[PDB]
């Protein structure tokens, strides 16, 4: 009745057997015209699909959605080549390694590179940074903005920030993230979560509390995938090691997993995790005051 379906026409389907919303969509057009006209059947089948959302779209319609997929440059051409252009949208990219490696440098570099117009007509956009480590430093972005020759205050105005103190708070923040993306449609292009799981290890530090930890972690990660795909944003998350933490839950949620390690002297190496030992699955990059860049 909200859409405009008649009061006397909704009670017609109750007599034959239709009593639930799932029974309306599952009843075929061939069997719906035996209670009826196909003009009223197309109005009952359309309104049911609005409320129930089966999620079925053709591969052509999915291809039109994937044509909007972009990549956000890491600041290093070699690293970008490895990723197929950079941090991909409609996907979660996870980067893990030691503390001395450039997980925080990559997080801060992306805060600036995501605002810059790039390859494939990428126009740049705003960023949402969720900080669980108390590591976000806006002063760090000023040095990176200097490297890209962009205004400091403008870079800082396009980054939204929030500290998460608990796993529950981290999940509540994702509700505000979705609402913010829904407000300024197509404005935001990157969601950074540094780090994705430290709060989950903290809140569920017992062997008996691991079942609820896994459930809450999987609920957040499935929501994160939905946000990345529904709003066409790149999701970049950092992770700790013990092998990366999170087991199969984080491995499944992430579409691209990058292992960061120290190389010769001040150089760093990025590799696709669990991939075979071959040169095409590895890339060399440098860390400077201007963020992630290429080797000298």
């Amino acid at each position: 009745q909200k859409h405009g379906i008649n009061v006397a026409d909704i009670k017609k389907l109750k007599s034959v057997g239709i009593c639930t919303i799932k029974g309306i969509q599952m009843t075929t057009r061939r069997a719906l015209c035996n209670v009826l006209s196909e003009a009223k059947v197309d109005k009952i089948k359309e309104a049911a699909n609005k409320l129930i959302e089966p999620g079925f779209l053709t591969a052509f319609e999915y291809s039109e959605k994937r044509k909007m997929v972009f990549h956000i440059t890491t600041g290093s051409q070699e690293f970008d080549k490895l990723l197929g252009g950079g941090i991909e949208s409609m996907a979660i990219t996870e980067a893990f390694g030691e503390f001395r490696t450039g997980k925080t440098q990559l997080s801060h570099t992306l805060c600036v590179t995501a605002q810059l117009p790039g390859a494939g007509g990428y126009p740049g956009g705003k960023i949402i940074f969720i900080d669980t480590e108390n590591t976000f430093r806006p002063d760090r972005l000023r040095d990176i903005a200097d490297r890209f020759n962009v205004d400091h205050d403008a870079v800082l105005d396009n980054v939204l920030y929030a500290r998460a103190y608990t796993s529950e708070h981290q999940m509540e923040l994702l509700d505000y993230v979705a609402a913010k993306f829904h407000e300024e449609a197509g404005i935001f292009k990157l969601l950074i979560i540094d780090s994705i799981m430290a709060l989950f290890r903290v809140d569920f530090s017992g062997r008996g509390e691991l079942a609820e930890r896994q459930q809450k972690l999987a609920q957040m990660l499935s929501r994160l995938q939905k946000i990345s795909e529904e709003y066409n944003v790149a999701v970049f998350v950092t992770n700790q090691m013990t092998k990366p933490i999170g087991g199969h839950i984080l491995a499944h949620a992430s579409t691209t997993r990058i292992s960061l390690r120290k190389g010769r002297g001040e150089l760093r190496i990025a590799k696709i995790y669990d991939s075979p030992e071959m040169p095409e699955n590895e890339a060399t990059f440098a860390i400077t005051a201007g963020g992630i860049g290429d080797a000298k």
Binding site: G125, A154, V155, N158, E184, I187
Partner: peptide
């Protein structure tokens, strides 16, 4: 609105 710098 987004002001690209």
């Amino acid at each position: 609105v987004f002001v690209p710098p």
